[PDB]
Amino acid sequence: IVGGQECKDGECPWQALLINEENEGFCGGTILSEFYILTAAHCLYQAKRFKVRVGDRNTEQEEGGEAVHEVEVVIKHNRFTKETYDFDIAVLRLKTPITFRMNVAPACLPERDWAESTLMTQKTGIVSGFGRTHEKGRQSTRLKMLEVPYVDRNSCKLSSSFIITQNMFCAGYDTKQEDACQGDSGGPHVTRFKDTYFVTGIVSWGEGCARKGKYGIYTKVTAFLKWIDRSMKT
Amino acid sequence: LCSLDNGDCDQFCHEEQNSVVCSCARGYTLADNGKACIPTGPYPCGKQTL
Ligand SMILES: CCc1c(N2CC[C@H](O)C2=O)cccc1S(=O)(=O)N[C@@H](CNC(=O)c1ccc(Cl)s1)C(=O)OCCc1nccn1C
Ligand SMILES: [Ca+2]
CATH class of the missing domain: 2.40.10.10 (Trypsin-like serine proteases)
Known part of the structure; x- marks a missing residue:
């Protein structure tokens, strides 16, 4: 920003951070529910593997409310166009559900x-x-x-x-x-x-x-x- | 009607047969007044955890 x-x-508190193999945040997401994150389809080409971190406000400290979640399934819009970023939407189902708390809410x-x-x-x-x-x-x-x-x-x-x-x-x-x-x-x-x-x-x-x-x-x-x-x- | 201060609805306002109808997102319940949206849990969607 x-x-x-x-x-x-x-x-x-709905802020999610997509983190790559080397634990670097490359894209954001929005918490929709305990199992589902909203993100941009184009973000899926930014890393070969990635996880979702929630409740993170400082990427150089451990504020204690942070948790990392594995993605079970990626749901990319079939009409996503890399040339124009048209249909730039994906939904991630997490392997484990988010627990809502301070800085973690949908x-x-x-x-x-x-x-x-x-x-x-x-x-x-x-x-x-x-x-x-x-x-x-x-x-x-x-x-x-x-x-x-x-x-x-x-x-x-x-x-x-x-x-x-x-x-x-x-x-x-x-x-x-x-x-x-x-x-x-x-x-x-x-x-x-x-x-x-x-x-x-x-x-x-x-x-x-x-x-x-x-x-x-x-x-x-x-x-x-x-x-x-x-x-x-x- | 939904143009007039969202028909007095807290959240979703819909005009059905000349009249306002209010509804609420998941994790909220419409109050007795048929307008206000009441959280059902401690972390309802769209609320800052202040
Ligand atoms: C010309 C735009 C563009 C395209 N696109 C898009 C379709 C069109 O066909 C085209 O060429 C592609 C790549 C780069 C760029 S860019 O260099 O001009 N701008 C960058 C940085 N700005 C922003 O991210 C924003 C500013 C305001 C809001 Cl809102 S997002 C960008 O858009 O990166 C997006 C990709 C990405 N996401 C995470 C990491 N990365 C690398
Ligand atoms: Ca942190």
Whole structure:
């Protein structure tokens, strides 16, 4: 995350971190339930083997609430396109269930019609992860959060040099130097409604990070709610 | 109606035959008022563990 604030105790408890063979966080995820993590399909090509760490806020300390989980099954969308990052969504079933506690809790899955009409017409959502704090920088050792304005489809399509599909939306600032960045991919985009946080996006991609006239690009979770629901029963 | 302050619903608002219907995510139960969403467990989804 470029700019924004540290996640304080209990603020981003749905944050999951995908860790590689050598125990390096490469992608984020969102805790949906005790068995299921939401992430980006493109994250599956970042490592040959990986596990999921939950309740981690500092990757250079043992705060004591951290736990690592083996992935039983990977459910990748069959229409994922590496060329465009279209259908950039995967669901992970864990071998062992997560135990909810301090800094370990699931984000709510919204209903599509309400999410699109009510959540994604709010001013801002919140993105989080251990991604880079500068475009050509190193990944954060602290979990960070950033409030990101929703961007209308039209302005976003105008902004992009790459294809913006119907499975994507855009969030962040035009000029202001705050954005998601490399390593944040697969992590949560959530929208607060009356003090409850609903998953509204997956960190997918961007033309570097925090660039003028450029936005963060998020998988439109609302379009995959039935797909997520179907994945979570197998 | 769901446009008017989410029809007074805590969470999901749906307009069915001219009237508001409220519902709640998994781990929540709709209260007697048919609007508020009550957690069923200590770690309901979408709540900061503050
Ligand atoms: C041109 C965009 C792009 C593509 N894509 C996407 C489809 C299109 O066809 C194309 O070319 C592919 C690779 C690199 C880049 S990039 O170098 O311009 N930007 C990086 C860094 N920025 C961000 O991660 C974000 C900024 C805001 C939000 Cl929101 S994510 C990125 O998107 O890495 C994603 C891959 C990844 N995830 C974890 C590790 N890694 C390496
Ligand atoms: Ca730690």
